């Protein structure tokens, strides 16, 4: 659904939302569109191993340099491994093929580090009560620019964290929504089509222009 996201972003950006005579950004908020998952922490150890991350439900994952993934559910033992071609298997930290020993050790180190360091993005949002073993999205791909880290999840979401001012976007093409986390850590979800109708501030508009450039990079 990256193509859908590109359509949604092209459309809002073509509407020049920060040039509305009267910007009514608030009218575009829709709390029912709040994302279920986003990346709360991340660790770039890609010079040797991969990109470790935590989702907001406290699950962990690693996208290894060889394009395989381990997903540790928030029960601390249940595990999914995703091979390069996307083949999925289920196991536990406690019972795993010997061939996965090194990757599991790496997972444990990333998990330990993010258990002990760093803040959780979105910590103000209520922890979800739901099925903690329902299939988790995983990190499909990521990259960094000078300004941001771009994280693309398997549920179609794209998250962009800006390094300098700590602002963040979580874009969902299924809800056709963007969640903006601002410098004060206010977390608000907007329908993109309503940003077209009602406008938005220049800060959000600028970030949505950058977002489109990033989605283009993901599609390339």
């Amino acid at each position: 659904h990256l193509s859908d996201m590109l359509q949604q972003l092209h459309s809002v950006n073509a509407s020049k939302p920060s040039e509305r005579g009267l910007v009514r950004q608030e009218e575009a908020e829709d709390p029912a569109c709040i994302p279920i998952f986003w990346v709360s922490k991340w660790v770039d150890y890609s010079d040797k191993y991969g990109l470790g991350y935590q989702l907001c439900d406290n699950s962990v994952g690693v996208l290894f340099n060889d394009s395989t993934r381990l997903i540790l559910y928030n029960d601390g033992d249940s595990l999914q491994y995703i091979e390069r071609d996307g083949t999925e298997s289920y196991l536990t930290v406690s019972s795993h093929p010997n061939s996965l020993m090194k990757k599991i050790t790496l997972l444990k180190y990333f998990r330990n580090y993010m258990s002990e360091h760093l803040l959780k993005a979105g910590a103000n949002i209520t922890p979800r009560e739901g099925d903690e073993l329902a299939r988790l999205p995983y990190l499909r791909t990521w990259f960094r620019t000078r300004s941001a880290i771009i994280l693309h999840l398997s549920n179609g979401s794209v998250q962009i964290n800006f390094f300098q001012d700590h602002t963040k976007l979580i874009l969902c093409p299924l809800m056709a929504a963007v969640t903006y986390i601002d410098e004060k850590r206010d977390f608000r979800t907007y329908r993109l089509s309503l940003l077209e109708e009602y406008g938005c501030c220049k800060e959000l508009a600028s970030r949505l222009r950058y977002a489109r450039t990033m989605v283009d990079k993901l599609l390339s």
Partner: peptide, 5 residues
């Protein structure tokens, strides 16, 4: 940055 905030 090599890690988040």
């Amino acid at each position: 940055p090599l890690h988040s905030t």
